[PDB]
């Protein structure tokens, strides 16, 4: 007991060797990590034109999870069940009637940029969900304007991976809802109304708003300290 004597370290300048603390802020990160972080910083500053700045404001948590909950019902089949459907069709084609009595009309969410754009132009799309992280932004930068012109409700959602998850693909750039059952018309209409309350009604004001242009960090702290006096 008396031999257990405290031996503290001052850790002052020139007193003792500094402890091994976290140095992640001053780490010389490799090129790709440095590039992606600097790219995020440059996008956050360097004021963005309204066409691109209309992104970065996606659906809220409740609306997004409700959209995906109603989206997960209309999944566009898989390989296994397609093979089962083909086998059933082959069995029925022997003696039974045609597809008018064996396989019903498909009910699934649409996908594919060209197909979705064509559906929007043809007014057959009831809802359009656009990914917010399309690396070439020109693929979808015209989609909100096209939907507004054609009267199609449109919402911007995050995680193109999440959009492709319901399609069973790695990434889906845009999803379109065209046909649904009769019982879920009310909930789909509520989703459309909530979507229009944020995107369609604010299209005119979003066309006149520029994003970015924020310095942040030391510059903002110095400006705040200068404005305090």
């Amino acid at each position: 007991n008396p031999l257990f004597v405290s031996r503290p370290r001052s850790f002052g300048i020139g007193q003792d060797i500094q402890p091994k603390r976290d140095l992640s802020r001053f780490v010389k990160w490799p090129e790709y990590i440095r590039l992606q972080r600097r790219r995020k910083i440059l996008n956050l500053r360097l004021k963005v034109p309204p066409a691109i700045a209309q992104f970065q404001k996606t659906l809220d948590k409740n609306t997004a999870t409700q959209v995906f909950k109603l989206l997960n019902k209309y999944r566009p089949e898989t390989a296994a069940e397609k093979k089962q459907r083909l086998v059933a069709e082959a069995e029925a084609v022997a003696n039974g009637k045609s597809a008018q009595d064996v396989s019903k009309k498909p009910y699934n969410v649409k996908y594919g940029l060209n197909h979705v754009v064509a559906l929007i132009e043809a007014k057959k799309a009831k809802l359009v969900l656009i990914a917010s992280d399309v690396d070439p932004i020109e693929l979808v930068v015209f989609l909100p304007a096209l939907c507004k012109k054609m009267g199609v409700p449109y919402a911007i959602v995050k995680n193109k991976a999440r959009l492709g998850t319901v399609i069973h693909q790695k990434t889906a750039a845009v999803l379109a809802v065209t046909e649904v059952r009769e019982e879920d018309k009310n909930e789909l209409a509520s989703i459309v109304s909530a979507v229009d309350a944020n995107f369609s009604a604010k299209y005119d004001e979003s066309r006149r708003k520029w994003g970015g242009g924020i310095m942040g960090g030391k510059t903002q702290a110095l400006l705040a300290k200068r404005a305090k006096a």
Partner: peptide, 9 residues
């Protein structure tokens, strides 16, 4: 994810 060294390896 605490790094005690400023060099990445």
């Amino acid at each position: 994810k605490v790094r005690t060294s400023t060099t990445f390896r």
